[model samples]
Target: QVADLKAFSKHIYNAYLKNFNMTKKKARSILTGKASHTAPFVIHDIETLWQAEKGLVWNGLPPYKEISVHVFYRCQCTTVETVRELTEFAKSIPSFSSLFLNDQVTLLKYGVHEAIFAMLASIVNKDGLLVANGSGFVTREFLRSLRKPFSDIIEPKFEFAVKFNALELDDSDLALFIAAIILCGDRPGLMNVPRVEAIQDTILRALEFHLQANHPDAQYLFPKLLQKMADLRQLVTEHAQMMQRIKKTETETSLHPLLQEIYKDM
Candidate 1:
């Protein structure tokens, strides 16, 4: 029944806090490294690039012909990690857990990228994105310095993120927003669309109510957030298309298995 909307909001908020290791605030703090001394090695130039590329970066006899490939490979690694976190967050929701096992996987399969892009907004800014678990900052200019297609991939996300950050949503708001993204009934191959819709409706109700209380002074915040959800869907579609080009043309740059699966039928 979702009788206590506030409680539902709080539960999801707790789940968000627990599942997500990197909140925007944390990402911002690590952006500068700020005398942590040993860690948060900033990777803005060729000098610091090796730090991120060292363990995860591929360097076979073929020699990774381009730096763009190296950057893309690192991004795939981070994407795989984000998938795991998003999976756990979905499972924590009661409605999501009630779904059939295969259905759960189905939702995550279609929805993870959308959820990932939305969450990416949390750690992203106009200047750069947080990488290596928010321990390294990769500047927008550096990413743009890469080859054509690779350079294009990240800039759109940066544009979306800077605008999204204007909404000023905290983790609590994002918790429900992400849940709503996963529980969407619009995804294809659902065994029970009505059930999923009901759950999503409950989430939206909670989010709308929560927003009124959370941002009482602001008008139209609820609708604005919903519009962002729509924007995110388009963003993910374009992102998938970009990845397809990478897979087709940039075959040398490997994609993680999980990421490949997510992109499989997309």
Candidate 2:
């Protein structure tokens, strides 16, 4: 979770530079309380909570479920000011309050899912560094589950892939995909077809490709990447529903009118 928090902060700083054409010095200054703007401050707090949750879930030993929830709740409460401000901001944006509320529920669910995966990854890799660094934890069942996902007794590649993909997605998605991915990844109850990894990977790759193809500069692409990720998430959700309706012999039509409008305006 520490890594997540750090990554999230970095993502926001990057976004500020990209979106506002500010220098690194200026961005850092703004984020570290030198500026009075609410946007970056709110983003920094959100990212911090995410990272803290990641650490608690990934690094805890056996019987991690309850502890992970406890840590997450603590982090959420600790950052209550940021949450309150963000909620208020959401209220100002048309339709944003509903979206934020829905996403908040999703984030809680995904946090749990990612915590489980992090524990498993830690156990399989036997990487004490991950735990020490406050990145993740390990467990016996998680080690057993690693048999198919990894070949070596020490799976450096897989661990790296997971962390890298997580950082990339967190950077690209910012708050939007953060909410959704957390939801999908951490859902309660047993589901027959769990695609947490797949969903995470797909979103990661898509955002990476988008960023690389369009805005290669880190400073220039960060905010654009955030917006694109948010838009893409909404589009993907709507499109899926549209497809489902079509399969059920309901109305067949474009599912993402908002996205269509965005594209046209761009």
Candidate 3:
């Protein structure tokens, strides 16, 4: 159904394009303050990174003492929302929704963050992400300016995203890549075995033809993307470990229920 899949792929591609089209220059322009005025959050060093924090959840929360708390919570919320959108995207693709309920959940539980971080590049530049829906961009330089444990989190993702975006795959290619990540057969607790495998193979086939048809000059791009997924897997592995340590040291902050469930037995 790869041919049949193309129409849906086009639909999804448009969604992806519509959502992730924020450009680096536009983001920088929007973020820069008016002349002769000091910027709100000036990141001089680790001591200064959290001097200002956006997304005021509670007034008395000490922004510096628990900067990671807010940042982590922000990412967790973002991840949860990412999961919701990806689930809709998966269900919209007939090949995926065709799986049983539990199987669909299993695949998403494992693959959602991977897709989130991958597509993250679409909205993020080398500078920062448009967190809180482009109203406030958490700058990369400033995030790196924070303390060790807290600062490392977003940088790795940005590193991966910057390099990944260099592949310059268009919207169509990304739509297929997103589909391939979610329709994975090797997720740890997949319930319906053959169905998962069948859909995976279908996606892989569709991805190959799409890659071949679109990127005629980009030899080995398909193989490269497969390896990139492995790298993403590795990055997410590191991401989970960091999250675990942050949770282990959970003093001022607690994880969201859905994230707790996702990381429960992993």
Candidate 4:
């Protein structure tokens, strides 16, 4: 499996390099670099436009909101450890302790598996107010629970928007978006699946369309672009499945084991 993985990695890397060369050559004229003599100006302008539009979309999001004020605990541990620590921490926090005792504390762990720890921590700490992390993941469910009596008063709408004109990026943006989706699972009256799906679909389509287009002015990075898109699709699918599995298990187990016990005793 390791060897196969390595081989696959090399194959993708080669494809990316081929596309990168084509893209770079096409973008050379407008890229504002040393290779202007050899690079085609029109192709470069197209690349610039592609990049500029992406920047606009990315820079348009709302500013980041602090999590410490609303959610008392910061999870700096692994997923398993964080789950255990958060349970005890919530028990320690006055507002959450009673609530945990009265009702089952369900941990809706969703999103990318690699980001499980951070996502879970953010959700638990939300303290009933929408908190935006640097990664653009919204923790509204955690905020709602923290709000308690006032939670009913506060209508939380969890959303993740990209910043506009924040130009620095490559294919990694898709990975970040996927992580955001994992963090923003199905929260009642808060998480918006359609909106997230729209963003994901649009971005993917745009990326694919740009790579595949065959025009003198079009950036010619089809091989690398397609490979990256494939990788992104696979990653998103894997994370989505992981999120679903976690949700299903949470439903079956009934709020993490410790949380259930705390509630029963309360």
Q: Which candidate ranks first by TM-score, i.e. highest?
A: 1
Of the two candidates 1 and 3, the one with more favorable lDDT, higher being better, is 1
Which 10-residue window in model 2 sums to the lowest lDDT?
Answer: 123-132
Give the least accurate 10-residue stretch of model 4, judged by summed lDDT: 156-165
Tens-digit lDDT track of model 4 for 1-266: 33443333333333333322122222222333344343221111323323423432122212322332112212211233434433443333232233323231322232223233223222222222111222122234433443232232222211211111122223223223222232232323323445544434443444444333322244444344344334433443444444345346433222234323422311
Candidate 2's error at 190, in angstroms?
Answer: 3.9
Off by over 4 Å in 1: 1-3, 32-40, 51-65
Better of 2 and 3 by lDDT: 3
Predicted candidate 3: what Cα RMSD to the true structure? 4.8
Regions of model 2 farther than 4 Å from truth: 1-29, 32-34, 37-76, 79-107, 110-173, 176-180, 183-188, 192-202, 214-266
Q: TM-scores for all candidates? A: 0.91, 0.25, 0.80, 0.20
Candidates in order: C-alpha RMSD to true structure:
2.8, 17.5, 4.8, 21.3
Better of 3 and 4 by TM-score: 3
lDDT measured at residue 261 in model 4 versus the true structure, 0 to 100: 40
lDDT (0 to 1) per candidate: 0.83, 0.35, 0.72, 0.30
TM-score, model 3 to reference: 0.80
Candidate of highest lDDT: 1
Candidate 1 per-residue lDDT, tens place, 24-131, comes to: 767665654653565555577776787666673224323466677877777776777788999999888887999988889889998888888888988887888777
Q: How do the residues 136-204 of candidate 3 rate in per-residue lDDT, one tens digit apiece?
A: 556787778666677878889999988997887766788889888988888988888888888777777
Give the clashing pairs for model 3: none
Residue 141's lDDT in candidate 2: 35
Better of 1 and 4 by lDDT: 1
